Design an enzyme around this catalytic site. Sequence first.
Site, PDB file in Angstrom:
ATOM      1  N   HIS A   6     -42.167  -4.073  36.419  1.00 22.23           N
ATOM      2  CA  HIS A   6     -42.503  -3.939  35.006  1.00 22.23           C
ATOM      3  C   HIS A   6     -43.309  -5.128  34.492  1.00 22.23           C
ATOM      4  O   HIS A   6     -43.953  -5.015  33.446  1.00 22.23           O
ATOM      5  CB  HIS A   6     -41.216  -3.773  34.185  1.00 22.23           C
ATOM      6  CG  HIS A   6     -41.434  -3.219  32.809  1.00 22.23           C
ATOM      7  ND1 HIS A   6     -41.927  -1.953  32.588  1.00 22.23           N
ATOM      8  CD2 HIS A   6     -41.205  -3.752  31.583  1.00 22.23           C
ATOM      9  CE1 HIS A   6     -42.001  -1.730  31.287  1.00 22.23           C
ATOM     10  NE2 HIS A   6     -41.565  -2.806  30.654  1.00 22.23           N
ATOM     11  N   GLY A  31     -35.590 -11.067  27.693  1.00 24.03           N
ATOM     12  CA  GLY A  31     -35.976 -12.115  28.612  1.00 24.03           C
ATOM     13  C   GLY A  31     -35.153 -12.174  29.874  1.00 24.03           C
ATOM     14  O   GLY A  31     -35.478 -12.969  30.765  1.00 24.03           O
ATOM     15  N   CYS A  73     -34.765  -9.732  32.104  1.00 23.89           N
ATOM     16  CA  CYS A  73     -35.300  -8.904  33.171  1.00 23.89           C
ATOM     17  C   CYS A  73     -35.537  -9.727  34.429  1.00 23.89           C
ATOM     18  O   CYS A  73     -36.142 -10.802  34.378  1.00 23.89           O
ATOM     19  CB  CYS A  73     -36.607  -8.269  32.697  1.00 23.89           C
ATOM     20  SG  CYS A  73     -37.167  -6.844  33.650  1.00 23.89           S
TER      21      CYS A  73
HETATM   22  C1  LIG Z   1     -31.738  -6.649  25.147  1.00 22.67           C
HETATM   23  N1  LIG Z   1     -31.882  -6.637  26.592  1.00 22.67           N
HETATM   24  C2  LIG Z   1     -30.899  -6.570  27.468  1.00 22.67           C
HETATM   25  N2  LIG Z   1     -31.433  -6.573  28.689  1.00 22.67           N
HETATM   26  C3  LIG Z   1     -32.754  -6.639  28.526  1.00 22.67           C
HETATM   27  C4  LIG Z   1     -33.737  -6.678  29.658  1.00 22.67           C
HETATM   28  N3  LIG Z   1     -35.103  -6.441  29.272  1.00 22.67           N
HETATM   29  C5  LIG Z   1     -36.014  -7.572  29.241  1.00 22.67           C
HETATM   30  O1  LIG Z   1     -35.626  -8.670  29.473  1.00 22.67           O
HETATM   31  N4  LIG Z   1     -37.390  -7.334  28.895  1.00 22.67           N
HETATM   32  C6  LIG Z   1     -37.814  -5.985  28.610  1.00 22.67           C
HETATM   33  N5  LIG Z   1     -39.185  -5.713  28.263  1.00 22.67           N
HETATM   34  C7  LIG Z   1     -40.046  -6.863  28.277  1.00 22.67           C
HETATM   35  C8  LIG Z   1     -40.672  -7.359  27.165  1.00 22.67           C
HETATM   36  C9  LIG Z   1     -41.488  -8.483  27.330  1.00 22.67           C
HETATM   37  C10 LIG Z   1     -42.226  -9.186  26.400  1.00 22.67           C
HETATM   38  N6  LIG Z   1     -42.839 -10.177  27.035  1.00 22.67           N
HETATM   39  C11 LIG Z   1     -43.729 -11.253  26.659  1.00 22.67           C
HETATM   40  N7  LIG Z   1     -42.497 -10.117  28.386  1.00 22.67           N
HETATM   41  C12 LIG Z   1     -41.661  -9.067  28.556  1.00 22.67           C
HETATM   42  C13 LIG Z   1     -41.014  -8.538  29.699  1.00 22.67           C
HETATM   43  C14 LIG Z   1     -40.212  -7.426  29.517  1.00 22.67           C
HETATM   44 CL1  LIG Z   1     -39.576  -7.070  31.147  1.00 22.67          CL
HETATM   45  N8  LIG Z   1     -36.909  -4.878  28.643  1.00 22.67           N
HETATM   46  C15 LIG Z   1     -37.353  -3.532  28.351  1.00 22.67           C
HETATM   47  C16 LIG Z   1     -37.700  -2.803  29.647  1.00 22.67           C
HETATM   48  C17 LIG Z   1     -37.681  -3.436  30.880  1.00 22.67           C
HETATM   49  C18 LIG Z   1     -38.006  -2.708  32.013  1.00 22.67           C
HETATM   50  F1  LIG Z   1     -37.992  -3.301  33.240  1.00 22.67           F
HETATM   51  C19 LIG Z   1     -38.357  -1.382  31.897  1.00 22.67           C
HETATM   52  F2  LIG Z   1     -38.688  -0.680  33.014  1.00 22.67           F
HETATM   53  C20 LIG Z   1     -38.383  -0.755  30.666  1.00 22.67           C
HETATM   54  C21 LIG Z   1     -38.049  -1.481  29.538  1.00 22.67           C
HETATM   55  F3  LIG Z   1     -38.062  -0.909  28.303  1.00 22.67           F
HETATM   56  C22 LIG Z   1     -35.538  -5.097  28.980  1.00 22.67           C
HETATM   57  O2  LIG Z   1     -34.817  -4.167  28.990  1.00 22.67           O
HETATM   58  N9  LIG Z   1     -33.052  -6.675  27.253  1.00 22.67           N
END
Ligand SMILES: Cn1cnc(Cn2c(=O)nc(Nc3cc4cn(C)nc4cc3Cl)n(Cc3cc(F)c(F)cc3F)c2=O)n1
EC number: 3.4.19.12
Lengths: 301, 301
Positions: free
Chosen positions: B41, B143, B145
Amino acid sequence: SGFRKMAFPSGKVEGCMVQVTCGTTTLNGLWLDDVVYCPRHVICTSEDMLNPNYEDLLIRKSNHNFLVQAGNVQLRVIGHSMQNCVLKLKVDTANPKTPKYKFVRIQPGQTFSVLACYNGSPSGVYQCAMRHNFTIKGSFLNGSCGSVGFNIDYDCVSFCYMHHMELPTGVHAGTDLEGNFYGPFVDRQTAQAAGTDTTITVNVLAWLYAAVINGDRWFLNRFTTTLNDFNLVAMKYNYEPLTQDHVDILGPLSAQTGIAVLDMCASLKELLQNGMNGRTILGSALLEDEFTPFDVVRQCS
Amino acid sequence: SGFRKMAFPSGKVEGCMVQVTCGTTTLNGLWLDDVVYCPRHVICTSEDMLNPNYEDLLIRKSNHNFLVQAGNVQLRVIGHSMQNCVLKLKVDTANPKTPKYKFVRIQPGQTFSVLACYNGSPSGVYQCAMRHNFTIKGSFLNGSCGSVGFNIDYDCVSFCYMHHMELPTGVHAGTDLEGNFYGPFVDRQTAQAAGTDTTITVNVLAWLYAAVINGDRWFLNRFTTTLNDFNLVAMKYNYEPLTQDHVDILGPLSAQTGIAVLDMCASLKELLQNGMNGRTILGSALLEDEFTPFDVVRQCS
Ligand SMILES: Cn1cnc(Cn2c(=O)nc(Nc3cc4cn(C)nc4cc3Cl)n(Cc3cc(F)c(F)cc3F)c2=O)n1
Ligand SMILES: Cn1cnc(Cn2c(=O)nc(Nc3cc4cn(C)nc4cc3Cl)n(Cc3cc(F)c(F)cc3F)c2=O)n1
């Protein structure tokens, strides 16, 4: 989202854990710079452990009586001294893995991470709180003596607990890293038992805020109470008095959720008086009191 | 004595955690030997994250599109490939802190430790279980992920989970380290939601044995049930069927306590049918199902 019993990453502490042996007595030590810290109980033989005179026992030891093993490497002991209930063994090698560190003493109601250790080898990490009776409800087996408790702030390890012994009720007693016991306990065999304990009210409120942040709201209500009226009810349930200091500390959580502290106190009062009626909060059917307001803020934001 | 939610010491995993950035998208990676593993992702921009075609997105990237930071040191990316839902970035430096390791996939009901990580920096460690619906009830913020779950056996780190996303109910979904999702989830925005979950019966029994080992015996009784008669009752309460395999696995705990498994099943049946009546077991007012028989044996002996 989610809320777990979360410990600090333990790597900085794992790199300081060693095994200390004196005669046939063995336990864990903490190697920082060129000093190894461990419970002075290591200088007791089986016949000494009941009622020892530690000043006598240490005068009868030499540096060569102490075997310190850091993994598969023996550390040469070049000096020894005792500070209250901890032994300090000066070694000829500074630990290359020494983190930035402090020795801090904590208060009842504060939390810390425990690295349970056996024969100098780390086994597990968990989170616990210092209780109002200065015990901790730990998880320790034979051989855990000298395991340490700590918090991490930025890059700095604040060591606050070194484990000594298990009390008859199965709870645990130990010292700060200056060798000073938490609570009215001594490192010998006496009739010592844990005093009465109370529920850490400010932590329960912090955890109720954690629940609201995570979408658990069923226990909220339209009511607000006065601090005095809350304390009159909470004490009947063996809860610690809530102070204005505690209310102030809960301010950030009150701001993030928009629920005033005395509004949440009305929920807690109702939970105490009515029970939880087959429902749960953050996956628990009890009111949890081993998360501080800082723990909640750290984990939820 | 004592029983805690205990994680494995996290140091061996902390030494592998890095930050991976592609464009403005940032997450955590796992650096083992000369390869960094992270969720694919990371190659999505904000406009891609809804419905991406990952094969297209990766063909459009170069090695220089990936910024890998190990602390304050940039790692030069010299190759990239994707394996299912994980990206593999070959770097020009082998991680000197690489532990002995394996990539293993776990089963529902098994437990593992999670090192929650943000911007490549470890934040906390906790213990959780793979649920029957292939989610985990984690604690993760934005953050997180790329944070990983693992067990440690002797000196060997068995990585079993890499975190991808949070589902609408606040529970968490991810992959094994081969990039294969646990459960029917995909790394994009769909109507996906967690399926129905069940209580892990063999773990509840293991935890009741932990309670007996720790002197909590109030729930024991003179009765024994048949496996079929237990399962008829337990299923009504949304408990997983108990098998002879589960009975066999509980053998060591049955031996240490002298309580046959079907004797303890009669306690569990009564607890399910009658509740707990204001009492607690190992400090909980619920039947806990995220300790395996191996976890209990490890912690209690
Ligand atoms: C509340 N929560 C609980 N667990 C998580 C894990 N998580 C994450 O950490 N980040 C995500 N989206 C990103 C946005 C970004 C913005 N910037 C600058 N960089 C980013 C990187 C990510 Cl990975 N997501 C959402 C998400 C991650 C995926 F790997 C996916 F396949 C679908 C998704 F909707 C996330 O859930 N957040
Ligand atoms: C069940 N449990 C929970 N926590 C503990 C901690 N603990 C411990 O690990 N060891 C102890 N006595 C020793 C025996 C030894 C035998 N050999 C070869 N080496 C030994 C070293 C020790 Cl330290 N104790 C008991 C204990 C330790 C003290 F430091 C003390 F002041 C009084 C005590 F009764 C112990 O509680 N076990």
